[PDB]
Amino acid sequence: AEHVRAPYNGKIKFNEDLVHPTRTRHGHPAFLCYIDLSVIIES
Amino acid sequence: TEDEARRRNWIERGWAPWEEILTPEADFARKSLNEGEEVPLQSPEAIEAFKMLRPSYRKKKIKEMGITEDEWYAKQFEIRGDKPPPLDTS
Amino acid sequence: GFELDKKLGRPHPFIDPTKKKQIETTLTSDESWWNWRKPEKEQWSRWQRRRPDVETVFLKAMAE
Amino acid sequence: VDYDDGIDFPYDDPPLVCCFGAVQKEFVPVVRVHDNPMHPDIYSQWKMLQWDPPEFGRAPGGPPSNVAISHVRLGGRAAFMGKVGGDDYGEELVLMMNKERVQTRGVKFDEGASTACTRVKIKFEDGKMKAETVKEPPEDSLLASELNLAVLKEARIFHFNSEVLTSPTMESTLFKAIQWSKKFGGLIFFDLNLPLPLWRSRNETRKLIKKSWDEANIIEVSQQELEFLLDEEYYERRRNYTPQYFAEDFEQTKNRRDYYHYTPEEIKPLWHDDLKLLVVTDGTLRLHYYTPKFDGVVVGTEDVLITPFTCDRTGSGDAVVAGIMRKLTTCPEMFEDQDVLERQLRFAVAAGIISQWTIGAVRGFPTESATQNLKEQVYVPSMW
Amino acid sequence: FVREDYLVRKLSAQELQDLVKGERKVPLIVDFYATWCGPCILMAQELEMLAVEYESNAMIVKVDTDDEYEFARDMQVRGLPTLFFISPDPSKDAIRTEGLIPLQMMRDIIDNDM
């Protein structure tokens, strides 16, 4: 398992309608991604 | 069987299905763990519970329903299940 | 000022103050999940103080 | 009274404080009866009463010299006013105060007196052995003509204990010194530290301490001292109360230790017009403060179990009082700002905490750097 | 067969009264202490050493203030540790010392005042 870490301080910008809500093995709400999602950090 | 065991619990052990007023987190935990460990939630109740995790969404929903927040909180404490027949005190 | 101190290596901010923008407004803990909410009260950490070292003392002396 | 003394000077920083009374080694004055004694001979068990102390001895105070030494170690300037004999022990005490950089220019020597020695005669009144004082010790025999008016002029806080009230000579000298100090603009700090005789009865002690109580701008008492002075049985009953059927709130269900904060209406009998700050200390755990404008409590802590073999609570109250004076002399806004007052009282809490980690009062007094480090370690950064 | 580890004896108020009333040949040193008092441990060790030094030329006793609180208050005890040096001559007056005084100070008092 590889962890993507934020490379800058900023504001996360992505559309939540392209991802499917799930529940992590740690009990947290999360979004499952099956596409080539693009996430914007406004640093 | 699971019809006489419930009756025996009620009679001999005081069981009753009292309403559990849950927070959005506990409600989401109950509704979402019924599907799987890490799966795309499909049951509409689980999707709604996921949406209710943010109180802003709940405020927008209740604004759409045109009711204030106070009695929506009071709406939580409603007795679920069937109601007993009314009393005819003769 | 800038664009010359950066060229020559003279002391200058890493980010130009003029070419700098704020980070707008983020979630207010009312449109956020429970696991991403800032705790109401500050939490004791045992890492709340910055570790002393030689570099900090020498940098403060050189700034003086 | 009539004129001034010496030569006026701008005076160096930090502002000087004066500690008035007897200079003694150790000698905790507050003594009561405890119901959990250890072995009468095996003193290696007596450390168990240092981590499970009697409530009156949770943060014991001592002689004013302890407060002076602690105040100097915390970065302040202090002077001691009192008398010692001209023998070896008096010179040893003065040397101890000098090595701690406490000003001993206010110390008066008596060549004909034995330091810390009292002449008594033993009598057998009504079938019980008793004693009466023949010649008071030199620490109780400071005269108003032996005062040091330069010290009383420079000092910004005048500190004394109720042990001087057990001696008439020291009582008269104390009141003359208070007059001189108030003339020059100093503040009067009454640190009660009731000795063994003054726990006999409430009304007698109230009458004995009323004048000095009314002559004080700052007063520090322990929880036990305050409750003895107001009503011991009422608060004892209040602590023992338990609801019969259900608690009135969720927090009452936890059976936590009682940290009752006295209302200013309850403090009203002991309040007067010149009182700027009253501090009630439940050891280092709680610091209840009362001002004419506001009141509150500073939550503290303690851990003597972190070092079970070196912990000793002697001198902790002296460290708390010294920290209070250290922050008062350099932060005048404490008397008027509540947030600043609590932030500065956390410093005294830390100073009292460190002082419990060492055997010996003088030996274990913390420095300003260590106290500030512990304060920043214990509290979250927003409470600094 | 096994020697006792402590030579300083603990006495009651009544026993101390009887000791003071009776004929005394050597100086009597009375110690007031409490087990909850931190300084009393060092005083206890110092008085054990003093008792070792003065084998039969002095009498060292101790009174617990948690058992004789009223007796201690009557004897003009204002704190702990407190020592009373009682001379064998009834005409002379006893000496009360307050604080953790040095062992040499105790020796001087016993030699030149009792």
XYZ file of C-alpha atoms in Angstrom:
695
model
C 0.000 0.000 0.000
C 1.369 3.377 -1.107
C 0.306 6.652 0.508
C -0.147 9.794 -1.566
C 0.952 12.759 0.539
C 0.172 16.415 -0.030
C 3.253 18.091 -1.569
C 2.180 21.638 -0.629
C 0.066 23.537 1.859
C -3.139 24.547 0.129
C -6.819 23.986 -0.528
C -8.043 20.696 -1.992
C -10.170 21.185 -5.120
C -11.912 18.242 -6.776
C -15.426 17.256 -7.806
C -16.983 14.778 -5.373
C -19.479 13.490 -7.968
C -16.799 11.517 -9.855
C -15.997 9.397 -6.777
C -18.005 6.817 -4.845
C -18.436 7.145 -1.058
C -17.062 4.272 1.007
C -15.850 3.442 4.518
C -12.190 2.762 5.233
C -10.880 -0.175 7.235
C -10.154 2.448 9.917
C -13.805 3.515 10.094
C -13.510 6.815 8.251
C -15.703 8.196 5.469
C -13.814 8.295 2.183
C -14.190 8.385 -1.594
C -13.369 5.401 -3.787
C -11.734 6.304 -7.100
C -11.940 4.141 -10.226
C -10.954 6.817 -12.776
C -8.027 9.133 -13.552
C -9.080 11.766 -11.039
C -7.397 15.182 -11.000
C -7.021 16.922 -7.626
C -6.061 20.601 -7.355
C -4.144 22.051 -4.401
C -4.375 25.857 -4.312
C -1.050 26.585 -2.636
C -37.035 -20.455 16.623
C -36.764 -16.670 16.284
C -40.380 -16.003 17.211
C -40.687 -17.813 20.555
C -37.177 -16.850 21.673
C -38.137 -13.180 21.332
C -41.375 -13.776 23.246
C -39.466 -15.587 25.995
C -36.962 -12.723 26.175
C -39.801 -10.218 26.525
C -41.623 -12.211 29.194
C -38.811 -13.656 31.326
C -35.968 -11.159 30.774
C -37.675 -7.794 30.280
C -36.586 -7.256 26.676
C -38.176 -4.416 24.701
C -37.123 -2.698 21.439
C -36.492 0.743 22.895
C -35.618 3.401 20.339
C -31.893 4.109 20.008
C -31.500 7.785 19.111
C -28.204 7.817 17.218
C -25.808 10.483 16.039
C -25.100 10.727 12.294
C -21.785 8.951 12.898
C -23.353 5.966 14.678
C -26.202 5.799 12.156
C -23.689 5.819 9.290
C -21.627 3.145 11.050
C -24.682 0.897 11.370
C -25.959 1.510 7.833
C -22.582 1.251 6.076
C -21.033 -1.742 7.857
C -23.980 -3.842 6.642
C -22.543 -3.720 3.106
C -18.877 -4.576 3.588
C -15.490 -3.472 4.842
C -14.235 -1.233 2.000
C -16.882 -1.269 -0.734
C -18.657 1.396 -2.827
C -21.814 2.024 -0.821
C -24.891 1.085 -2.855
C -27.877 0.929 -0.492
C -29.637 4.332 -0.569
C -29.832 4.427 3.231
C -26.034 4.177 3.425
C -25.649 6.917 0.804
C -27.990 9.172 2.779
C -26.119 8.402 6.008
C -22.855 9.325 4.275
C -24.394 12.629 3.168
C -25.673 13.374 6.691
C -22.130 13.194 8.112
C -21.828 16.915 7.331
C -24.255 19.051 9.378
C -24.296 21.639 6.575
C -25.966 19.075 4.311
C -28.495 18.336 7.059
C -29.231 22.052 7.436
C -29.765 22.380 3.683
C -32.016 19.302 3.699
C -34.177 20.612 6.541
C -34.336 24.020 4.844
C -35.601 22.255 1.717
C -38.162 20.454 3.892
C -39.176 23.877 5.242
C -38.935 23.073 8.957
C -36.776 24.547 11.698
C -33.901 22.720 13.372
C -35.419 22.534 16.866
C -38.327 20.221 16.089
C -36.156 18.279 13.651
C -34.062 17.508 16.724
C -37.354 16.763 18.479
C -38.341 14.662 15.451
C -35.488 12.296 16.351
C -37.162 11.349 19.649
C -40.210 9.782 17.988
C -41.501 6.381 19.064
C -40.843 3.889 16.274
C -42.765 0.742 15.434
C -46.474 0.079 15.651
C -48.767 1.974 18.016
C -51.036 0.312 20.593
C -54.818 0.455 20.114
C -56.409 3.501 21.769
C -58.072 3.247 25.163
C -61.862 3.061 25.508
C -62.311 3.587 29.253
C -65.945 2.652 29.881
C 14.850 43.921 -4.268
C 13.494 40.564 -5.370
C 14.520 38.906 -8.654
C 18.008 40.245 -7.872
C 18.576 38.974 -4.335
C 17.285 35.633 -5.605
C 19.717 35.802 -8.532
C 22.741 36.800 -6.437
C 21.858 34.525 -3.521
C 21.382 37.373 -1.054
C 18.937 36.757 1.821
C 15.402 36.881 0.433
C 12.054 35.164 1.054
C 11.558 31.865 -0.734
C 8.164 33.108 -1.975
C 7.945 36.652 -3.310
C 5.562 38.615 -1.038
C 4.084 40.446 -4.037
C 3.480 37.205 -5.972
C 1.766 35.626 -2.957
C -1.895 34.764 -2.430
C -3.891 33.531 0.542
C -5.529 30.106 0.588
C -9.149 31.323 0.461
C -11.690 29.861 2.917
C -11.752 26.159 3.779
C -14.219 23.886 5.563
C -15.634 25.375 8.767
C -16.134 22.092 10.695
C -19.834 22.381 9.841
C -19.313 21.046 6.298
C -16.632 18.557 7.345
C -16.516 14.935 8.437
C -15.908 14.087 12.083
C -12.367 12.823 11.472
C -11.270 16.097 9.810
C -12.603 18.513 12.445
C -10.212 20.558 14.548
C -10.596 19.579 18.233
C -12.577 22.067 20.293
C -9.867 22.304 22.968
C -6.136 22.247 22.289
C -4.628 18.846 23.056
C -1.456 18.255 25.050
C 1.153 16.652 22.826
C 4.649 16.411 24.397
C 5.749 17.589 20.943
C 4.232 21.063 21.376
C 7.641 22.707 21.924
C 10.210 22.999 19.156
C 13.378 20.997 19.745
C 16.458 23.068 20.663
C 19.592 22.669 18.572
C 22.826 24.388 17.573
C 21.383 25.680 14.295
C 18.693 27.826 15.934
C 21.140 29.493 18.330
C 23.700 30.179 15.613
C 21.055 31.495 13.202
C 19.672 33.839 15.864
C 23.190 35.100 16.618
C 23.901 35.662 12.914
C 20.581 37.493 12.560
C 21.536 39.698 15.507
C 6.814 58.736 60.223
C 8.445 62.153 59.773
C 11.129 62.097 57.052
C 12.948 59.805 54.610
C 16.231 57.886 54.730
C 19.438 57.785 52.718
C 19.697 59.053 49.145
C 17.023 58.710 46.473
C 18.063 56.518 43.542
C 16.323 55.152 40.423
C 16.836 51.614 41.858
C 17.834 48.532 39.856
C 15.579 45.797 38.391
C 13.894 43.489 39.259
C 12.075 45.347 42.067
C 13.259 44.395 45.536
C 11.114 42.426 47.977
C 11.579 42.191 51.740
C 10.963 39.060 53.812
C 10.370 39.794 57.498
C 10.584 37.234 60.267
C 12.847 34.447 61.467
C 15.534 32.719 59.407
C 15.457 29.004 60.205
C 16.608 25.768 58.596
C 13.569 23.751 57.469
C 11.084 24.008 60.362
C 7.671 23.710 58.770
C 5.337 25.693 61.082
C 1.972 24.191 60.113
C 1.399 21.152 62.351
C -1.895 19.312 62.831
C -2.965 15.771 63.696
C -2.760 13.109 60.988
C -4.551 9.767 61.257
C -2.118 7.715 59.115
C 1.206 7.427 60.957
C 4.089 5.257 59.813
C 6.564 3.277 61.901
C 7.817 5.431 64.814
C 11.443 4.342 64.258
C 11.822 3.265 60.619
C 12.133 6.606 58.838
C 12.578 4.794 55.518
C 8.789 4.315 55.534
C 8.096 8.012 56.132
C 8.539 8.839 52.441
C 5.191 7.093 51.899
C 3.607 10.061 53.697
C 5.336 12.371 51.217
C 3.417 10.926 48.266
C 0.249 10.397 50.347
C 0.481 13.507 52.506
C -1.883 15.013 55.043
C -3.968 17.655 53.312
C -2.568 20.475 55.449
C 0.934 19.407 54.401
C 0.415 19.060 50.654
C 2.465 22.189 49.855
C 3.985 23.224 53.195
C 5.459 26.661 53.720
C 8.296 27.680 55.978
C 10.252 30.643 57.317
C 10.473 33.856 55.267
C 14.109 33.046 54.460
C 12.866 30.131 52.345
C 10.644 32.533 50.404
C 13.542 34.960 49.954
C 15.896 32.246 48.684
C 13.253 30.852 46.331
C 12.451 34.340 45.026
C 16.117 35.025 44.289
C 16.498 31.662 42.530
C 13.486 32.564 40.368
C 15.298 35.664 39.083
C 14.177 38.266 41.623
C 16.003 40.432 44.144
C 15.149 39.909 47.805
C 16.279 41.188 51.193
C 15.750 39.531 54.571
C 14.932 41.569 57.687
C 15.512 39.879 61.029
C 17.929 39.209 63.858
C 20.353 36.351 64.491
C 22.779 35.722 67.315
C 26.511 36.248 67.171
C 27.338 32.560 67.541
C 28.317 30.008 64.890
C 24.745 29.092 63.928
C 23.729 32.685 63.222
C 26.778 33.182 61.018
C 25.940 29.910 59.259
C 22.391 31.099 58.546
C 23.632 34.468 57.282
C 26.181 32.677 55.082
C 23.405 30.472 53.690
C 21.375 33.561 52.812
C 24.455 35.277 51.340
C 25.445 32.386 49.059
C 21.884 32.530 47.702
C 22.414 36.239 46.890
C 19.801 37.367 49.407
C 20.541 40.821 50.790
C 21.549 40.518 54.442
C 22.061 44.245 55.069
C 18.776 44.056 56.997
C 20.089 41.318 59.297
C 20.917 42.478 62.831
C 23.412 40.563 64.962
C 23.163 40.049 68.724
C 26.463 39.008 70.291
C 24.841 38.020 73.592
C 22.160 35.713 72.155
C 22.190 32.091 71.005
C 20.642 31.699 67.555
C 17.447 29.616 67.424
C 17.585 28.947 71.181
C 14.742 29.773 73.574
C 14.842 29.748 77.371
C 11.784 28.076 78.897
C 10.753 26.920 82.365
C 8.872 23.658 82.873
C 5.799 23.755 85.122
C 3.134 21.238 86.138
C -0.106 23.221 86.076
C -3.262 21.188 86.855
C -1.397 17.886 86.625
C -0.076 18.434 83.088
C 3.468 19.399 82.159
C 3.740 22.809 80.495
C 6.391 25.347 79.531
C 6.625 29.136 79.525
C 9.134 31.348 77.736
C 11.839 32.992 79.843
C 14.075 34.564 77.177
C 12.938 34.773 73.571
C 15.345 33.733 70.797
C 17.091 36.467 68.787
C 14.865 35.676 65.796
C 11.874 36.874 67.853
C 13.773 39.819 69.375
C 14.099 42.369 66.575
C 13.393 45.904 67.767
C 11.849 48.755 65.800
C 15.106 50.682 66.285
C 17.007 47.826 64.595
C 15.065 48.039 61.324
C 16.717 48.975 58.023
C 14.856 51.913 56.498
C 16.716 51.758 53.178
C 15.448 48.206 52.619
C 11.905 49.175 53.601
C 12.098 52.151 51.237
C 13.402 50.191 48.244
C 11.295 47.056 48.737
C 8.138 46.974 46.625
C 6.593 43.993 48.448
C 6.770 43.400 52.205
C 6.388 39.731 53.137
C 5.846 38.179 56.565
C 4.259 35.160 58.242
C 1.920 34.760 61.206
C 4.745 33.225 63.247
C 5.789 36.734 64.308
C 2.343 37.091 65.922
C 3.415 34.470 68.480
C 5.967 36.976 69.843
C 4.991 40.425 71.186
C 8.320 42.098 70.389
C 8.167 40.814 66.820
C 4.519 41.885 66.611
C 5.315 45.491 67.544
C 8.340 45.510 65.235
C 6.200 44.045 62.443
C 3.579 46.757 62.757
C 6.199 49.517 62.817
C 7.821 47.972 59.729
C 4.432 47.778 58.004
C 3.887 51.472 58.759
C 7.287 52.309 57.273
C 6.700 50.128 54.202
C 3.251 51.584 53.506
C 4.727 55.073 53.867
C 7.213 54.430 51.048
C 4.653 52.790 48.748
C 5.335 49.091 49.244
C 2.783 46.290 49.210
C 2.120 44.064 52.216
C 2.127 40.310 51.558
C 0.604 38.247 54.379
C 1.567 34.574 54.039
C -0.363 33.064 56.933
C 1.443 29.754 57.596
C -0.354 29.188 60.879
C 1.980 27.602 63.463
C 0.902 24.868 65.858
C -0.499 27.198 68.598
C -2.743 29.087 66.148
C -4.812 25.993 65.283
C -6.378 25.788 68.754
C -9.631 27.629 68.021
C -11.098 29.729 65.225
C -12.175 32.822 67.173
C -8.912 33.175 69.102
C -6.868 32.982 65.899
C -9.208 35.426 64.140
C -8.754 37.960 66.939
C -4.988 37.366 66.926
C -4.604 37.850 63.157
C -7.292 40.452 62.405
C -5.003 43.494 62.581
C -2.241 42.041 60.400
C -4.927 40.601 58.114
C -6.375 44.097 57.632
C -2.883 45.546 57.097
C -2.211 43.285 54.081
C -2.683 43.932 50.366
C -1.855 40.367 49.258
C -2.825 37.298 51.293
C -1.985 33.647 50.641
C -3.678 30.934 52.690
C -4.035 27.213 52.225
C -7.419 25.551 51.808
C -7.159 24.163 55.340
C -6.255 27.585 56.763
C -9.149 29.312 54.984
C -11.660 26.657 56.027
C -10.399 26.770 59.615
C -10.780 30.554 59.623
C -14.338 30.447 58.216
C -15.886 27.135 59.333
C -14.204 23.722 59.383
C -17.252 21.555 60.096
C -19.450 23.150 57.429
C -17.001 22.407 54.618
C -16.192 18.982 56.060
C -19.911 18.146 55.895
C -20.188 19.647 52.408
C -17.362 17.444 51.111
C -18.882 14.307 52.661
C -22.314 14.925 51.118
C -23.499 12.322 48.610
C -26.836 12.461 46.745
C -29.155 9.684 47.832
C -30.837 8.679 44.557
C -29.126 10.269 41.544
C -26.525 12.884 40.699
C -27.554 16.375 39.627
C -25.230 16.238 36.604
C -23.046 13.744 34.772
C -19.817 15.086 36.279
C -21.067 14.299 39.795
C -21.179 10.588 38.889
C -17.388 10.299 38.531
C -16.646 10.679 42.277
C -13.723 12.958 41.466
C -11.644 14.776 44.058
C -13.383 17.845 45.435
C -12.029 21.149 44.122
C -14.748 23.389 45.547
C -14.305 27.063 44.638
C -15.411 29.313 47.481
C -17.776 32.082 46.464
C -16.783 35.690 47.243
C -19.902 35.792 49.429
C -18.285 33.115 51.605
C -14.999 35.056 51.483
C -16.857 38.252 52.453
C -16.097 38.027 56.227
C -12.345 37.975 55.499
C -12.397 40.713 52.845
C -11.392 44.323 53.453
C -10.816 47.482 51.439
C -7.034 47.388 50.914
C -6.976 43.713 49.858
C -5.898 43.554 46.212
C -5.405 39.794 45.838
C -6.340 36.739 47.894
C -4.916 33.370 46.835
C -6.156 30.080 48.290
C -3.856 27.161 47.477
C -4.911 23.505 47.476
C -1.289 22.506 47.232
C -0.193 22.939 43.639
C -3.419 21.339 42.370
C -5.649 24.415 42.712
C -4.962 28.151 43.038
C -8.173 29.979 43.945
C -7.688 33.717 43.449
C -9.936 36.558 44.583
C -9.703 40.227 43.623
C -12.161 43.096 44.246
C -13.273 42.811 40.605
C -13.181 39.087 39.808
C -12.398 35.619 41.122
C -11.494 32.239 39.712
C -9.286 29.182 39.981
C -6.078 28.108 38.240
C -5.971 24.363 37.596
C -2.590 22.859 38.404
C -1.162 19.403 39.016
C 1.513 17.499 40.902
C 3.592 14.369 40.469
C 5.780 13.302 43.368
C 5.387 9.651 42.304
C 7.593 10.358 39.272
C 10.550 10.303 41.708
C 9.438 8.265 44.739
C 12.879 8.247 46.398
C 13.717 11.969 46.156
C 10.288 13.603 46.503
C 9.785 15.920 49.481
C 6.993 18.474 49.763
C 8.822 20.760 52.210
C 9.213 24.228 50.711
C 6.631 23.865 47.920
C 4.416 26.620 49.312
C 7.449 28.869 49.688
C 8.147 28.322 45.988
C 4.527 29.127 45.117
C 4.627 32.361 47.129
C 8.014 33.302 45.658
C 6.700 32.759 42.135
C 3.633 34.856 42.928
C 5.834 37.716 44.138
C 8.203 37.306 41.178
C 5.363 37.712 38.701
C 3.689 40.492 40.718
C 6.807 42.671 40.850
C 7.239 42.520 37.059
C 3.601 42.303 35.853
C 1.410 45.019 37.411
C -1.469 43.972 35.124
C -2.036 40.831 37.221
C -4.058 42.843 39.743
C -6.430 44.054 37.008
C -6.442 41.434 34.209
C -7.828 37.976 34.942
C -6.298 36.180 31.947
C -2.874 37.659 32.692
C -3.340 36.741 36.356
C -3.989 33.076 35.542
C -1.146 32.943 33.014
C 1.285 34.321 35.593
C -0.062 32.051 38.352
C 0.705 29.002 36.207
C 4.360 30.013 36.661
C 3.996 29.753 40.443
C 2.220 26.420 39.966
C 5.208 25.106 38.003
C 7.627 26.471 40.613
C 5.733 24.643 43.346
C 5.686 21.447 41.280
C 9.467 21.407 40.799
C 10.122 22.167 44.474
C 8.491 18.861 45.506
C 11.051 16.773 43.590
C 14.020 17.268 45.940
C 14.813 16.458 49.557
C 15.174 19.719 51.443
C 13.423 23.058 51.006
C 16.433 25.246 50.182
C 18.235 22.483 48.285
C 15.294 21.967 45.920
C 14.197 25.499 45.021
C 13.867 25.771 41.222
C 15.416 28.367 38.958
C 13.471 30.593 36.584
C 14.615 28.682 33.491
C 13.575 25.286 34.864
C 10.257 26.699 36.089
C 9.460 28.228 32.696
C 10.469 24.990 30.957
C 8.163 22.933 33.179
C 5.341 25.439 32.701
C 5.645 25.212 28.919
C 5.892 21.413 29.072
C 2.866 20.866 31.325
C 0.411 23.326 29.779
C -0.743 23.590 26.174
C 0.766 26.574 24.299
C -2.501 28.547 24.397
C -2.378 28.626 28.214
C 1.139 30.109 28.353
C 21.580 -11.944 70.277
C 20.593 -9.285 67.736
C 21.231 -5.685 68.760
C 18.449 -3.165 68.242
C 18.803 -0.771 65.322
C 17.525 2.328 67.169
C 18.655 3.778 70.499
C 16.226 6.711 70.762
C 13.142 5.631 72.706
C 9.622 6.913 72.081
C 7.735 8.032 75.187
C 4.211 9.154 75.998
C 3.308 12.459 77.620
C 2.744 10.718 80.965
C 6.031 8.805 80.741
C 7.874 12.021 79.877
C 6.217 13.758 82.840
C 7.372 10.957 85.133
C 10.883 11.122 83.666
C 11.117 14.889 84.186
C 9.700 14.677 87.719
C 12.114 11.949 88.776
C 15.739 12.393 89.744
C 17.963 12.866 86.691
C 21.753 12.563 86.564
C 22.390 13.105 82.836
C 20.868 15.683 80.478
C 17.528 14.768 78.921
C 16.947 15.616 75.252
C 13.306 15.513 74.140
C 12.484 15.350 70.428
C 9.111 16.290 68.952
C 8.527 14.721 65.552
C 5.891 13.527 63.111
C 6.312 10.784 60.525
C 4.617 12.938 57.872
C 7.234 15.685 58.350
C 10.064 15.577 55.828
C 12.744 17.288 57.935
C 12.116 14.852 60.801
C 13.921 12.037 58.951
C 17.236 13.899 58.963
C 16.647 14.921 62.574
C 15.960 11.269 63.412
C 19.274 10.194 61.886
C 21.141 13.028 63.627
C 19.625 12.078 66.977
C 20.533 8.428 66.426
C 24.120 9.558 65.843
C 23.965 11.766 68.950
C 22.639 8.868 71.039
C 25.522 6.748 69.762
C 27.962 9.487 70.792
C 26.506 9.984 74.293
C 26.285 6.370 75.436
C 25.268 6.881 79.073
C 26.051 10.597 79.490
C 22.755 11.753 77.958
C 19.197 10.523 77.479
C 17.559 10.955 74.066
C 13.786 10.509 73.821
C 11.207 11.354 71.179
C 7.530 12.319 71.359
C 5.191 11.952 68.386
C 2.941 14.974 67.891
C 0.249 12.796 66.298
C -0.151 11.067 69.683
C 0.582 13.977 72.070
C -0.586 17.000 70.089
C -2.075 18.776 73.109
C 1.016 17.977 75.186
C 3.237 19.408 72.445
C 1.111 22.560 72.256
C 1.336 22.963 76.042
C 5.142 22.664 75.911
C 5.283 25.681 73.531
C 6.019 23.751 70.341
C 5.448 25.949 67.287
C 6.674 23.539 64.613
C 8.806 20.553 63.727
C 11.550 19.560 64.247
C 11.717 20.891 67.837
C 14.175 19.835 70.547
C 14.039 20.403 74.304
C 17.293 20.218 76.271
C 16.380 19.583 79.916
C 19.156 19.973 82.474
C 19.417 17.501 85.378
C 19.354 20.452 87.796
C 15.730 21.522 88.452
C 16.883 25.069 89.255
C 18.126 25.653 85.705
C 15.809 26.253 82.752
C 15.364 24.092 79.665
C 16.376 25.150 76.152
C 14.109 24.827 73.109
C 15.767 24.708 69.685
C 13.746 25.001 66.477
C 14.962 23.796 63.093
C 17.484 21.316 61.735
C 20.332 22.448 63.973
C 23.798 20.915 63.450
C 25.032 17.980 65.499
C 27.898 20.124 66.795
C 25.325 22.637 68.044
C 23.622 19.847 69.999
C 26.991 18.801 71.423
C 27.762 22.382 72.463
C 24.365 22.788 74.138
C 24.694 19.497 76.021
C 28.267 20.181 77.130
C 28.065 23.861 78.096
C 24.413 24.364 79.073
C 23.067 21.215 80.770
